[PDB]
Design a protein around this ligand. Structure first.
Ligand SMILES: *[C@@H]1O[C@H](CO)[C@@H](O[C@@H]2O[C@H](CO)[C@@H](O[C@@H]3O[C@H](CO[C@H]4O[C@H](CO)[C@@H](O)[C@H](O)[C@@H]4O)[C@@H](O)[C@H](O[C@H]4O[C@H](CO)[C@@H](O)[C@H](O)[C@@H]4O[C@H]4O[C@H](CO)[C@@H](O)[C@H](O)[C@@H]4O)[C@@H]3O)[C@H](O)[C@H]2NC(C)=O)[C@H](O)[C@H]1NC(C)=O
Ligand SMILES: *[C@@H]1O[C@H](CO)[C@@H](O[C@@H]2O[C@H](CO)[C@@H](O[C@@H]3O[C@H](CO[C@H]4O[C@H](CO)[C@@H](O)[C@H](O)[C@@H]4O)[C@@H](O)[C@H](O[C@H]4O[C@H](CO)[C@@H](O)[C@H](O)[C@@H]4O)[C@@H]3O)[C@H](O)[C@H]2NC(C)=O)[C@H](O)[C@H]1NC(C)=O
Ligand SMILES: *[C@@H]1O[C@H](CO)[C@@H](O[C@@H]2O[C@H](CO)[C@@H](O[C@@H]3O[C@H](CO[C@H]4O[C@H](CO)[C@@H](O)[C@H](O)[C@@H]4O)[C@@H](O)[C@H](O[C@H]4O[C@H](CO)[C@@H](O)[C@H](O)[C@@H]4O)[C@@H]3O)[C@H](O)[C@H]2NC(C)=O)[C@H](O)[C@H]1NC(C)=O
Ligand SMILES: *[C@@H]1O[C@H](CO)[C@@H](O[C@@H]2O[C@H](CO)[C@@H](O[C@@H]3O[C@H](CO[C@H]4O[C@H](CO)[C@@H](O)[C@H](O)[C@@H]4O)[C@@H](O)[C@H](O[C@H]4O[C@H](CO)[C@@H](O)[C@H](O)[C@@H]4O)[C@@H]3O)[C@H](O)[C@H]2NC(C)=O)[C@H](O)[C@H]1NC(C)=O
Ligand SMILES: *[C@@H]1O[C@H](CO)[C@@H](O[C@@H]2O[C@H](CO)[C@@H](O[C@@H]3O[C@H](CO)[C@@H](O)[C@H](O)[C@@H]3O)[C@H](O)[C@H]2NC(C)=O)[C@H](O)[C@H]1NC(C)=O
Ligand SMILES: *[C@@H]1O[C@H](CO)[C@@H](O[C@@H]2O[C@H](CO)[C@@H](O)[C@H](O)[C@H]2NC(C)=O)[C@H](O)[C@H]1NC(C)=O
Ligand SMILES: *[C@@H]1O[C@H](CO)[C@@H](O[C@@H]2O[C@H](CO)[C@@H](O)[C@H](O)[C@H]2NC(C)=O)[C@H](O)[C@H]1NC(C)=O
Ligand SMILES: *[C@@H]1O[C@H](CO)[C@@H](O[C@@H]2O[C@H](CO)[C@@H](O)[C@H](O)[C@H]2NC(C)=O)[C@H](O)[C@H]1NC(C)=O
Ligand SMILES: *[C@@H]1O[C@H](CO)[C@@H](O)[C@H](O)[C@H]1NC(C)=O
Ligand SMILES: *[C@@H]1O[C@H](CO)[C@@H](O)[C@H](O)[C@H]1NC(C)=O
Ligand SMILES: *[C@@H]1O[C@H](CO)[C@@H](O)[C@H](O)[C@H]1NC(C)=O
Ligand SMILES: *[C@@H]1O[C@H](CO)[C@@H](O)[C@H](O)[C@H]1NC(C)=O
Lengths: 105, 48, 132, 48, 128, 48
């Protein structure tokens, strides 16, 4: 669960199980030592304050995995990422997914 | 054959009821000796 | 402005009724969905539950018995309560504000949707450990 | 075998503007056999 | 011949719910309707409702709706396909409902409405 | 039925191949309970 990408390139964070039903993922960002924050609050929609460089995967597909694509990776992306999936067949996931660290050169 | 059926993988709420049952059973293959274990899906209006 | 000031005993003896409060900033407790998150040491965080007045008090079914969330509208305070803590709940805690929202995937009249949750702003947190 | 996607109920649709207009027709011709000022109502097939 | 055998007499309390069998034999049960006639003293006969027993499509009276329910059970074996049984669950009784209940059947007559009932049941008296 | 076949009793040279297989199997008798063990002969163009 470690992805090392030098800056200038792109990054793809993969979390969660396979797509069983129609999903609605929730993506977070954990600062080291601090409290987590929010990145994506739907399949693709994001709140204000973060740039457009963060993106997500649509949850209208069946058989894929909840990705997290980042274009123009900078030094501020050196943090811990957590997926929080809400599938329509499995019940409420009270724990977050596989936390992957995106360390940048 | 006497089936063995569980809930289909779905978000089972108490208000709704299971429309589709799982029903994994035994059935003879094309060879008369062997018996494969296969599964299917079945509606609730087809199993008792 | 929105932020969350917390408290905590920190070092707790086992098998004790653990409690934890979390202050407000500007916004009142009566007008937001309130949720609580525990993050273990170096692990992925775990949703303790979510509380609100008028019904929305559904807990995490893993614990489901020794937890009790509660509101305090007079002090403008939210509160967590744990009864009989073991040595596995030694973690950090988080009070947080959450927004809801429905994602329809079919007919809305056949109850074919769900209401998810997401926590936009979080508290600063506290380390509540249990040892001797 | 498997069901891909979501478990949704099979349904049917009719247009409410069209269907209520058609019941406005058949409630006029039914009064030709049962006289006027007859409060014609419908129901949903009591049993069976 | 056509024979309709009913159930025996009962003694019920106000608020109970009777069930009156009517076992038909001697003809193909999947063809002919079965009605139900209640005979009250000082009021003459009174209709209740029929049951077309191919599928089980029923229709009751207007003043007895919500209180009557008629089911049927067919004969699912090819060794004896004529017999069958109709039912009637008369719910929410009253001391003003004590009467005699008959299950009837139309005649195989072809110039003949559904209502000129030829063969009758033996009669079941119900006391409340 | 899943057969069990050996070479027919013959002078097996490496140049030739077995044209006839032995193929002793199981098969129900006229009684439904018992199962006799019978053998036959079969050509190589009839068994896989
Ligand atoms: C008989 O009549 C009924 C009555 O209308 C009709 O039911 C309708 O069924 C359709 C589907 O068959 C339902 O359509 C869904 O609608 C929801 C809600 O969208 C509406 O509301 C939002 C509010 O914000 C508006 O923005 C939007 O424009 C609509 O007005 C949609 O969300 C659904 O689409 C998503 O989900 C699908 C499956 O997941 C995807 O295939 C689709 O691409 C959408 O996914 C996208 O959006 C997601 C949103 O987060 C996003 O996360 C994804 O990544 C992706 O980008 C869907 O269209 C409709 O609601 C029903 N009507 C009512 C009143 O509820 C029957 O269809 C009709 N029968 C026949 C045979 O015609
Ligand atoms: C063909 O389609 C018709 C039309 O939909 C169906 O008729 C409906 O059947 C359902 C199921 O029986 C009915 O739903 C029930 O309604 C009751 C009355 O609702 C009123 O009262 C409640 C409080 O009691 C209010 O909340 C509500 O707003 C209404 O004012 C409810 O009491 C029932 O709920 C109870 O049972 C369920 C299940 O156990 C529990 O989850 C509940 O908590 C509660 O205990 C239930 O909701 C519906 O009313 C019918 N529609 C009508 C009468 O117009 C037919 O059923 C369908 N055909 C077939 C064969 O199914
Ligand atoms: C997969 O399945 C699970 C199990 O059902 C779903 O979890 C439920 O989600 C619904 C979301 O609507 C919750 O419903 C909410 O209940 C509140 C009160 O709950 C009472 O009842 C439950 C049992 O029914 C008790 O356990 C509980 O203690 C309470 O006594 C209501 O107040 C809520 O209403 C509010 O939200 C709706 C949303 O539309 C508004 O319309 C209302 O006006 C109001 O604001 C709401 O109805 C439910 O509690 C959850 N749990 C259970 C056990 O049912 C998942 O949602 C589902 N889907 C996934 C994971 O995608
Ligand atoms: C219908 O009928 C025709 C006519 O017979 C068949 O055609 C013959 O098929 C056989 C089998 O393939 C052929 O036999 C082979 O001939 C090869 C050529 O023979 C020359 O070379 C060898 C040395 O290499 C000399 O000794 C010989 O005198 C010839 O000068 C041989 O090389 C083959 O032998 C090799 O394989 C066998 C088996 O593995 C070994 O035992 C040997 O030691 C050696 O390794 C073999 O003998 C024959 O030539 C064909 N006839 C022709 C071409 O006229 C058809 O096959 C048949 N139809 C079907 C469907 O089978
Ligand atoms: C009806 O029930 C059957 C019986 O459980 C379901 O089939 C089985 O489903 C499980 C869970 O998806 C499968 O297990 C998985 O297998 C993959 C590949 O081997 C593995 O990588 C996973 O870790 C997991 O073990 C299993 O393969 C599958 N089949 C059998 C024969 O057991 C079935 O899914 C149910 N019906 C529906 C509609 O879901
Ligand atoms: C399908 O066949 C298998 C093989 O016989 C059955 O499995 C056995 O069933 C008996 C009777 O219940 C048990 O005593 C054995 O312990 C079972 N063995 C195993 C390895 O499972 C099985 O029950 C049959 N039915 C289904 C639905 O699978
Ligand atoms: C039933 O479905 C058909 C096709 O899915 C609908 O016909 C379409 O209606 C829309 C709305 O006016 C038009 O824009 C399309 O051109 C129509 N297509 C065709 C092929 O006719 C129809 O309206 C639907 N009816 C109901 C009652 O839902
Ligand atoms: C024919 O039936 C017999 C009787 O069951 C089979 O013999 C047994 O086969 C099983 C499965 O291979 C073995 O575990 C037993 O040890 C066998 N017992 C004996 C006494 O042989 C036999 O395999 C079947 N098939 C053939 C080709 O004979
Ligand atoms: C499975 O279906 C039965 C049908 O009555 C239901 O009672 C039960 O809640 C469903 N779910 C589970 C997990 O058994
Ligand atoms: C149905 O059509 C009649 C015809 O005039 C109209 O008056 C009525 O408002 C319609 N809608 C109903 C009965 O809901
Ligand atoms: C009922 O109303 C229609 C209106 O067109 C009228 O023609 C008819 O005569 C009326 N019926 C009687 C019995 O008057
Ligand atoms: C039997 O037939 C096979 C078929 O390939 C052959 O290889 C083998 O040599 C034959 N003889 C013996 C003794 O197995």
């Amino acid at each position: 669960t470690f992805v090392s990408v030098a800056p200038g390139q792109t990054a793809r964070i993969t979390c969660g199980e396979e797509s069983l039903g129609s999903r609605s993922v929730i993506w977070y960002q954990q600062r080291p030592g601090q409290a987590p924050s929010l990145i994506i609050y739907n399949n693709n929609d994001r709140p204000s304050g973060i740039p457009d460089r963060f993106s997500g995967s649509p949850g209208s597909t069946f058989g894929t995995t909840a990705t997290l694509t980042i274009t123009s990776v900078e030094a501020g992306d050196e943090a811990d990422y957590y997926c929080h999936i809400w599938d329509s067949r499995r019940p409420t996931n009270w724990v977050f997914g596989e936390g992957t660290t995106l360390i940048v050169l | 054959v006497t089936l063995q059926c569980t809930n289909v993988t779905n978000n089972i709420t108490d208000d709704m009821r299971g429309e589709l049952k799982n029903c994994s059973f035994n059935m003879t293959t094309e060879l008369r000796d062997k018996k494969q274990k296969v599964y299917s899906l079945f509606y609730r209006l087809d199993v008792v | 402005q929105v932020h969350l000031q917390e408290s905590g005993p920190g070092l707790v003896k086992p098998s004790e009724t653990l409690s934890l409060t979390c202050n407000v900033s500007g916004t009142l407790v009566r007008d937001n969905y309130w949720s609580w998150i525990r993050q273990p040491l170096g692990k992925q965080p775990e949703w303790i539950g979510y509380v609100h007045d008028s019904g929305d008090t559904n807990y995490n079914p893993s614990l489901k018995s020794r937890v009790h969330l509660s509101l305090d509208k007079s002090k403008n305070l939210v509160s967590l309560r744990l009864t009989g803590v073991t040595a596995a709940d030694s973690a950090i805690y988080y009070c947080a504000t959450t927004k809801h929202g429905r994602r329809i995937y079919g007919v809305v009249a056949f109850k074919e949707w769900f209401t998810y949750f997401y926590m936009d702003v979080w508290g600063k947190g506290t380390s509540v450990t249990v040892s001797s | 075998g498997d069901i891909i996607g979501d478990i949704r109920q099979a349904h049917c649709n009719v247009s409410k503007a069209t269907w209520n207009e058609t019941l406005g027709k058949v409630v006029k011709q039914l009064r030709k056999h049962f006289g006027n000022n007859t409060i014609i109502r419908f129901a949903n097939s009591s049993g069976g | 011949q056509v024979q309709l055998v009913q159930s025996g007499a009962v003694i019920k309390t106000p608020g109970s719910s009777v069930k009156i069998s009517c076992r038909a034999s001697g003809y193909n049960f999947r063809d002919y309707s079965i009605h139900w006639v209640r005979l009250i003293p000082d009021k003459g006969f009174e209709w209740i409702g029929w049951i077309k027993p191919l599928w089980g499509a029923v229709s009751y009276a207007r003043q007895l709706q919500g209180r009557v329910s008629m089911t049927r059970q067919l004969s699912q074996d090819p060794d004896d396909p004529d017999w069958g049984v109709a039912y009637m669950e008369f719910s929410g009784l009253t001391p003003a409902d004590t009467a005699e209940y008959f299950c009837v059947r139309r005649g195989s007559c072809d110039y003949c409405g559904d209502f000129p009932w030829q063969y009758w049941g033996q009669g079941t008296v119900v006391v409340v």
